Paper text:
Consistent with active degradation, we observed the proteasome in processing states, where FAT10–Eos was engaged by the ATPase motor and partially threaded through the central channel, and in the nonprocessing, engagement-competent state with the NUB1–FAT10–Eos complex bound to the proteasome surface. Nonprocessing and processing conformations were easily distinguished on the basis of the major conformational transitions that occur upon substrate engagement and lead to a coaxial alignment of the N-ring, AAA+ ATPase ring and the 20S core particle. The processing conformations of the NUB1–FAT10–Eos-bound hs26S proteasome at both the 30-s and 60-s time points showed substrate density extending through the N-ring, through the ATPase ring and into the 20S degradation chamber. The length of this substrate trace suggests that, in addition to the unfolded UBL1 domain of FAT10, UBL2 was pulled into the central channel. At the entrance to the N-ring, we observed unresolvable yet more defined globular density that may represent the tough-to-unfold Eos domain of the FAT10–Eos fusion. Interestingly, the NUB1 UBL domain remained bound to Rpn1 at this stage of substrate processing, indicating NUB1 retention at the proteasome after FAT10 unfolding and threading. Outside of the NUB1 UBL domain stably interacting with Rpn1, there appear no other contacts persisting long enough for high-resolution observation by cryo-EM. This is unlike the deubiquitinase Usp14, which uses additional interactions between its catalytic ubiquitin-specific protease (USP) domain and the ATPase ring to enable substrate deubiquitination. Our cryo-EM studies suggested that NUB1 remains bound to Rpn1 after the FAT10 portion of the FAT10–Eos fusion substrate is translocated, although this may also reflect binding of new, potentially uncomplexed NUB1 because of the high concentrations in the sample.
The ubiquitin-like modifier FAT10 targets hundreds of proteins in the mammalian immune system to the 26S proteasome for degradation. This degradation pathway requires the cofactor NUB1, yet the underlying mechanisms remain unknown. Here, we determined a previously unknown mechanism for substrate delivery to the hs26S proteasome, in which NUB1 functions as an ATP-independent chaperone to trap FAT10 in a partially unfolded state, recruits it to the 19S regulatory particle through Rpn1 binding and presents the FAT10 unstructured N terminus for engagement by the ATPase motor. To determine the structural details of NUB1-mediated FAT10 delivery, we solved the cryo-EM structures of the ATP-hydrolyzing hs26S proteasome either 30 s or 60 s after incubation with the preformed NUB1–FAT10–Eos complex.
Numbering used by the authors:
A (entry chain M): 5 to 244
B (entry chain L): 4 to 241
C (entry chain A): 290 to 433
D (entry chain J): 2 to 137, 141 to 240
E (entry chain H): 3 to 234
F (entry chain A): 194 to 241
G (entry chain K): 8 to 127, 134 to 241
H (entry chain O): 51 to 94
The structure:
Amino acid sequence: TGYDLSASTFSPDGRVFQVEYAMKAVENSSTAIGIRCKDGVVFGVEKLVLSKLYEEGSNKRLFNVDRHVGMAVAGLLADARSLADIAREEASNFRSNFGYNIPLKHLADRVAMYVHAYTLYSAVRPFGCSFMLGSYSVNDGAQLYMIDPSGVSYGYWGCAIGKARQAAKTEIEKLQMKEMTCRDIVKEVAKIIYIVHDEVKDKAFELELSWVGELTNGRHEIVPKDIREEAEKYAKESLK
Amino acid sequence: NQYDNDVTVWSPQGRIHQIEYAMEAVKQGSATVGLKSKTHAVLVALKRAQSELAAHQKKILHVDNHIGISIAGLTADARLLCNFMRQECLDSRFVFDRPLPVSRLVSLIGSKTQIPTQRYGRRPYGVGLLIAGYDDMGPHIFQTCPSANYFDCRAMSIGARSQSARTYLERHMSEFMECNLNELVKHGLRALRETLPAEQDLTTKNVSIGIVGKDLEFTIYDDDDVSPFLEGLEERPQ
Amino acid sequence: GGDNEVQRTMLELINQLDGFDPRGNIKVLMATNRPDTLDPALMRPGRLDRKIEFSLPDLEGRTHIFKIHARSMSVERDIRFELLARLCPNSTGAEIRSVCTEAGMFAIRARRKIATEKDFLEAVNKVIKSYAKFSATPRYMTYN
Amino acid sequence: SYDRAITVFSPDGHLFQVEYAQEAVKKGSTAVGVRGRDIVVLGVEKKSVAKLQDERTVRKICALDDNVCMAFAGLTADARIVINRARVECQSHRLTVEDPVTVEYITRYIASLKQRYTQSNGRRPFGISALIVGFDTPRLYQTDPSGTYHAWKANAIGRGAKSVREFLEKNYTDEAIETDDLTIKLVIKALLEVVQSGGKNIELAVMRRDQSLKILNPEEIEKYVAEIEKEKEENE
Amino acid sequence: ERGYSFSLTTFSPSGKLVQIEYALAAVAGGAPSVGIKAANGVVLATEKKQKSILYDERSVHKVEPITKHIGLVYSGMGPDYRVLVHRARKLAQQYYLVYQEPIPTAQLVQRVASVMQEYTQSGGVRPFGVSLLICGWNEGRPYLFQSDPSGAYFAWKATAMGKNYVNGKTFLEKRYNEDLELEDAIHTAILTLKESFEGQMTEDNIEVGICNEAGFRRLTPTEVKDYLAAIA
Amino acid sequence: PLLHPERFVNLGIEPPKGVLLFGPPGTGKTLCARAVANRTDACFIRVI
Amino acid sequence: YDRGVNTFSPEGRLFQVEYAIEAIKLGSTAIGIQTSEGVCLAVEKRITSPLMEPSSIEKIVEIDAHIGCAMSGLIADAKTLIDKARVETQNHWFTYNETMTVESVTQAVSNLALQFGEEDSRPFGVALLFGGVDEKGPQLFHMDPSGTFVQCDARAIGSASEGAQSSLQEVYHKSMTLKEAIKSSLIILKQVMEEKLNATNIELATVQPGQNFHMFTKEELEEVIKDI
Amino acid sequence: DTDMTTQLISSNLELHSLSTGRLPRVVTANRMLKQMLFRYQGYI
Amino acid sequence: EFPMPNEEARARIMQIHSRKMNVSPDVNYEELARCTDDFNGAQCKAVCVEAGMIALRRGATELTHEDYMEGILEVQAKKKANLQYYA
Amino acid sequence: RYDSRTTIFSPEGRLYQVEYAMEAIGHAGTCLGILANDGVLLAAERRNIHKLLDEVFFSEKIYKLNEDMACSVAGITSDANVLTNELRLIAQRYLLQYQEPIPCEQLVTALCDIKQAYTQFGGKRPFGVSLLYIGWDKHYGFQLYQSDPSGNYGGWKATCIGNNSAAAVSMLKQDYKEGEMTLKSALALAIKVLNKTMDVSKLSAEKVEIATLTRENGKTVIRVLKQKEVEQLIKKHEEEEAKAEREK
Amino acid sequence: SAGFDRHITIFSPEGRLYQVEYAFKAINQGGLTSVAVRGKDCAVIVTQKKVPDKLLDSSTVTHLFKITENIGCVMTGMTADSRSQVQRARYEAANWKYKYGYEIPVDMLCKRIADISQVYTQNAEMRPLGCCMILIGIDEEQGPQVYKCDPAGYYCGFKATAAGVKQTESTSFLEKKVKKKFDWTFEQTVETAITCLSTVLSIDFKPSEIEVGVVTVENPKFRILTEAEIDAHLVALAE
Ligand SMILES: Nc1ncnc2c1ncn2[C@@H]1O[C@H](COP(=O)(O)OP(=O)(O)OP(=O)(O)O)[C@@H](O)[C@H]1O
Ligand SMILES: [Mg+2]
């Protein structure tokens, strides 16, 4: 209290409380997980369908930053869309200034700086979304990164953001992600998402998969309907 | 509490209260409904008259030959947004010589309306937009909220007393795709009348319709033009 | 320490209103023209369920109040009470009654047995305008 | 609670800072002005200066242009700024268009300039009210710290406003302005209705048709005061 | 009148700019420094006592040169000192470019005082929480000035700022004579700092600079040790 | 809820048992209370 | 919540524009009627002093030769809006060689009004009644500080807006003539004015399709007045 | 032209040396001179 | 500790306190729970009671969703009106 | 309260920040100005006179703006410095434009206008400096002017500001003869009024600086009196006081 | 007293800038500790590597950043602010090299970073970056150099220093160390750094829980020791 209104104010114990408020705002969003397989990265996002009136795919939280980069936003949706636009612009500028696809580590760094720059001024508020950037290339392997509202970014082997981050992380650590290709990581991700989902509280939901890997030639694309149905069947078969 | 005065201040619960108040501003406007068939997108709005003899306020705005919107919220924000999308559609038609697809326009609307929700100085656009438009990917009924979050809705309703219309749309959603233009407009009129109180009824002087179809540009029907759609409507049970 | 005893009495009233030992068929009326100082426990809608708000009357309401309070007065039949109601924008019913009494007083000062419209206008100026604000006529020239 | 900013409307739609700006005028010395058939006269309550103070710098009647003059009431520095801006604008208008600035136009410019300082926060409104008299037809206008101008046959602003205007309405007759001397005597009487010292605290400026300004020396004003006293001596 | 201690552009009802006084208090809570002008030049001495041996004594120098003939020491906040040093050097270089002659000490002091004033005329900017003691030599005459966060500059013959500045001034007016020399000045300044120095004056704990006819030069630690031995 | 309670139990609504009259002074709260006491037909207790 | 034009309330209302309508409420009464024969437009003058020139009270202004306007509220904001309307009419004539439709004039004035907060000021506390003939016929429009505007068959603004509006609803029909519209406006003004109605407490204006000229009444006011 | 260029470069290098307390390098002088002259497109 | 009711908790409280009332099946209790943020259980019961009383005032036989919204407005003493600048 | 910002009008129409600056002027050192036939002088008290303060400017309170103009100073040190520099800039701009010295009064108005700006635009504290102006021109000859933090100015023949300004102005009112005052009489009057206003006795010369303005063969020489002549002025005042003691 | 601690430009009545002190307190919010030791012909930094998750890619968790081929840095405090200051320092080094031809000294790197921090401290536009930077570099004619830069804009050279939660204890241990004259060899410098960190943390220091950056006169290139080299140094320390 008092040290809490602006992101430019430091609390007496030394923390920016607006940033932490943004983090716990992200905490209230639906879970979204990302797992880098042996030869790629798979993003699995649960999406709470608030009203049946929404069409399928509306408010999709999978964003294609570049030809080879995908995002798995979680948190405020408008902030997520704005950050997606920022990441797309950064990738386009890198392509136009250097002539080749932006490395996902550098792209994550730049978008992390853009996020962090909004946690310094009293005129602007910290971004209310935390996202995942995933990519694959034949020269850099498979890479995954997570950016929080604070702007802190480092690579993860597999992670979750949203409501059940810890619950999904318990079921993520029990996978030997270094070995299997993403073809089976897809159904494993679907099973994890279906387990972490709370049917009695979040009512209905839709699971959206995306992947970027050698099986996809390196481009990040939404998982085709057949594989999505197979993964959903696998997840449903694990009811006991 | 003390975190309620600015859109730039995060609440300790993780909420932006000014954003929620901007959402609350939508229900201050009258109810409007939008719904799409496999071939047409139709949005019906209930117009409000401030005096017994003053004209009813325009509720459906014309944006482009293939895109038209209904407004529920601040008149100033609605007019400013309408001007912005008119300019965007004109620029798209000037550069690419192709009508702007509805999805890209709605994404631009969300991007534009998110700026006030993060940078201090300008309040969030306190208006909900029902965007009905036909493009090469079929008819579309988007809805845009003041929090700059846009939903691709099969059939939506926003404004005051619009929950009944939303329930009606949820119940009758399955029949919307395989409906002709007249059946779709009658379903929209029924959804609109669900919001009306018991004493009020949909007359030709307070209903505005907007239709954009396969071979039909976005046309707005008001007053007598509403009558062909109004006639033949089943009377509300009582 | 504060009041304590008054707070204890208020707490017992709270207990009687709602809680264990159901209150019964005891409908409770409470009035206060400063409600923001009340205890939230008392203001909770289990003790004071309905919160009826009395607001400054509109034009029609102020006309009705003027007619009510001028009913017994010995006034003219041509008094445009809508005019007087519009001449007191932000005024309570008590101020309307005071305006009527002041119009009668003006009609008594110069010993007329009928209170005319000019008396009511003078009363409105004496009651509302004479103590409303310091927005003088040169400062009131800012609006037209 | 709604009087600490200029852009905040009060719950009853009052711009309270704008209203407060008029108290600065209410604190100024009385300035009266009338218009006649061939003259425009304006007297000023010229309050006594200190013994060692030079009264040349203390000027309340300022000529905006050769065809229009102006007497203010309120803060002196704001008055200086407004007078300088009015002179510059009148010269610029004469530059752009050949015909000289009309008194109505210069009053419109002054009112707009005062208004544009009441529309923005972080900009204190001008605390002066002005009487602008000129020929195009003798015309008298009065501005306002709010930014509103008006056309008057006769005003008085400043300390004595209600009293001098009350004297003025039942004194400004057709025969009162029939003679130039009659109009100047009317101005002198109106100023004497408030300035209770006589002669020593009265400064009247008269502008005749197609003529120049002429500040009345404290001997012509003394003669007019003596004539007014002789005329009023008919009571006994 | 605590309600007027926050705004830098708001006069108190007693007509005092409280924030400038708070900046001056921050100055007075700084490291002790002395500056004394003798008939041969000026001497500026300061206490560069670190919090531990770990700090590199020679890393940062408190007494800094502005031109060949102008030096400048400080008391108050440290980081603001570097900004003021950079602005003073830039002003000296601009004056040299315009006039081809090294900037006079009085003119540099005036320009630096104006620079410090620029940070006291607006809200949202903090006054320079440091006071500058500037020595120079022009026209065969020593010059010593003190510039303040308020932008006020005077022409101190001999003064002390920082912690126990009252003690330094009290020690002065006793050991100070207008007909002294640069060596006597060095000795007097070292003694004045000793009146407010806690611990042994290690050659690395004290920084002394001399503004003489040949210009401004900061004393090497060997000379500081020699003077300390001659004093103690 | 006193003169005609049957209009409530039929709809299964328990009517509110308390009312707080609040507003600007002189708006008519005490006048309405006086009217209630005037035509209460039940036990009215004006607590001091 | 009621301190800036950029702060929303828990109910979603902007508690600053409503204050601008309140500022409107303490102006002066203005009645406007649109009939098939034209537009009539009456205002109570609210004279403050006999010395003050009545022609200085600009409650009625000429936006163009075909469209007139009536204000209510702050003089400064109203005159700014009136100048804006005149400038837009002249610009539209310059760029299109045609008379601007009163709907478009009101649109332009409203477009200026909506900018009370747009840049990274305050609402114009004044309602405007724009009467005038266009290619579709006579028309009457009303605009408020928020920039919302609407065509009104007969609208009352300023003080006494509620009572004048109620009486207008009582006495207005679709097929009124201009003379009877003037008579109704004058009787309503007399009934809603504290001062006795005569030639100096009110001003009248009217526009006709074929008689756009004489967009005012000068000493023929008494002709209608004593035939009340 | 050469006089003012050399004087400005000398002043900038004096500021640099004062900020570093070390002897300036010829590389720095050459670099600053070349960028300043290139910015003016050979007009100096 | 007894926390302020959650959105789902508020919907459940409204459902319990509407058990004895003739509530229409079309009422969306989730929408009401969204519309009554920072409402305690007593306030939700007051919402249900006010909705029933309003349905009595309307002269109806079953409670509607709009009646529940009007009761929500009544509980916090708000009085919704059609502002001119919204339309 | 309505004193937080310079642009906030009080309900009585008083700018409280401006009045605060005016009252704060009283903290500044006493500086006085007297007009007289063929002359006009300023005098000022050195205030802070500590023995360790070298006196190298000799004019810490008197400044020369133009060739035929000079100004005193009483207020904030930084505001005084910027105001004097800007006065010099305005005078030199006028001289460059018109090739004629600025006729005193205009210069005052110029600076005053700028001060008025700081009392109108937000985000700027009013210039808490009031200063006297002495000069000569081709229009009104020797002129003395008084300025205020509000930007208001006035012509004067004898006036003082700073510490004990009211007592000084009352003494000048009592002991000034309009028309028949010369430079010597003006200097004696300034010395005596400084002695009475300054609480310190005997009015030590090094605590007081006097600067005179006189026309000499069309050269409008502005002089600042050295300590030596102030010694003899103080001695003259002491001997007049001793002679006046003879009445007892 | 403590009512003046909401804007960084407001001086307290005691003349204290409380927001800068709060940034100093926020320095410890990272939860880690870094120690830098300057040897006779080398400089060494060792920082805590806390990876409290088997899912993190341990390669990217590094708190050691290479500002320039010869100038290395270790960051303490909030990770985002530290990375922002790292990129700012890299840009400043690149600008110095481009504008002056030769490589920027570590002296100037910390001086410029401190100047930026001070500018943020005096102008209430940006919140001060609560990240402490320690730069190591082989500056010719001066040997190894270790510098510390704080949110206040106070840069200082150090024979040995530390930052983080256990800053006072590590500085005290180093003060006990650098006082007994000893041959500060490269192995000795690494030994002193690791012993400082272990003594202040009482941790057995498995090789994956710490990160070591090394610069040496023999090779003036910022080198990050591999886990095998960390194990070799630890086993040499134990015996
Ligand atoms: N609507 C109304 N009609 C007629 N008279 C009214 C009305 N409202 C108020 N009054 C008058 O107001 C007078 C005093 O008001 P009342 O006693 O109700 O005050 P209150 O608002 O309850 O104030 P308090 O804060 O002292 O409790 C009554 O005697 C009555 O004549
Ligand atoms: Mg009562």
